[PDB]
Design a protein around this ligand. Sequence first.
Ligand SMILES: CNc1nc(N)[nH]c(=O)c1[N+](=O)[O-]
Ligand SMILES: CNc1nc(N)[nH]c(=O)c1[N+](=O)[O-]
Lengths: 269, 269
Amino acid sequence: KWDYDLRCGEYTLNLNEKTLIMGILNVTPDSFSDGGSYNEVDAAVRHAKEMRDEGAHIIDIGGESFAKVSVEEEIKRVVPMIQAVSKEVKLPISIDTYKAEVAKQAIEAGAHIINDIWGAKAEPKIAEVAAHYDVPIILMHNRDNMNYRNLMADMIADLYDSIKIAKDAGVRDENIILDPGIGFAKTPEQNLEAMRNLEQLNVLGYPVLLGTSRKSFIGHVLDLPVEERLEGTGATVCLGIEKGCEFVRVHDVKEMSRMAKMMDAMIGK
Amino acid sequence: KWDYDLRCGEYTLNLNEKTLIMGILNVTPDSFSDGGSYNEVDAAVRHAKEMRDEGAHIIDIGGESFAKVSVEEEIKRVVPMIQAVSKEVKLPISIDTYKAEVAKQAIEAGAHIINDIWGAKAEPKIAEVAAHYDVPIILMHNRDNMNYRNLMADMIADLYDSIKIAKDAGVRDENIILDPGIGFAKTPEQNLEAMRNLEQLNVLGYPVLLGTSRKSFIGHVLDLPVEERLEGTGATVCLGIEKGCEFVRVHDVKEMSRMAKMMDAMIGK
Ligand SMILES: CNc1nc(N)[nH]c(=O)c1[N+](=O)[O-]
Ligand SMILES: CNc1nc(N)[nH]c(=O)c1[N+](=O)[O-]
């Protein structure tokens, strides 16, 4: 399906061999620090190690989500975490940020991939940062409103607008990944419709990452709280893989890695 | 999709509303009994109650699987269990047997559905029993050999041979359910191919039940023992539902009911 691998500097990810698991780093800050304090960084490193041991392929690290923080404060949180994880855990790191300056400092600190929940629309200079460092960037579907004329047609148009911003900044096709933004600017009903129709995104010709883990729409369907959503997350991961996604972004790496390996064997990936 | 409901005597199962969950009753016999002894029956009733509370729609009960047993001995085991479950748990019961006489006595004891792992081929009179009591019968794909010319084409031919045996005995179309027999007369590789192609079975025009729970092919893929196959079972259940199956036969009812409910919401069932 893919005639290239994802080049992540010292690491390379094959897009044809298996579904790639992105583990969500828990990044809980210490209350009396703005810092790369031992407790907060050590906890993050331990968590990165555990996700690696349970089958993660990428570690996703962010700096907001928790005391309110300015850009300078966000960088001071995320940089020490990227530095320590990048030294201690041999996996590529994605930086979860929509801000150009955070992206830039995170890459300088050791991050390999930019993960942007606003798809280069909140701060278009992030695509300039991406193009310059020659890193993959994930362009997620998101909007400041839910006024769809036609959900899937509109998602694809919106994503194409993100692709144009990136390509116009010099991002190469091989460095673009798309994501439907499940749970962003969508009703519960719309998140289900997007899942049901996820294979449409494949027409744009880029790899697709799916983020559904523990999201409210699963709670809407099952009437279950956040800590009781493993089975529902699982269903979303399996459907996403059947519909052709190359990556899943998940909290529960052990369980979802197993589900994904089984799905891969069945579909012939 | 279906213009009829499954009529199960006092119970009715709708085939359009949700994926139907068949819970596998654990049926462990007491060693010094041939009997409906208290320990063995009480344990079965407790297990049926738990599966009901966790979302099961049907309870599957068998008499072999454990001391060796003749037909008379198999009936003496299963009848007391069917009697007690049928009195205490308000769900339809399927009798897991390929033997005409067991089926007949089980229905007399209160069973609603015949679940036949040999698809009326081991004892064709079982279809006569089915037609007479006007009960649904599950015709599973099975063979005494793995010599396929072409796996899916051969499974469909084999299943059609089962359908012909049932219809020739007077079984009505509305009382036929098919099952691909995952883990029967198939290599691990063939069980994966069958999963990947399960939607072909839908051309025959009958509802489909999928049984994958905890099976060796999942162990083959994940290199995990029987008690560590929940995530793999889950993947198989999700793929089966996406490929249009109406029932799943499972050990872990809580977890698989949740997965199935989420899948149903996504696919628009
Ligand atoms: C950084 N956060 C995310 N990133 C991507 N790419 N997709 C998501 O669904 C989410 N998410 O749900 O939070
Ligand atoms: C009674 N046992 C079964 N019955 C059906 N219908 N399908 C199965 O896969 C199995 N099974 O795997 O054991």
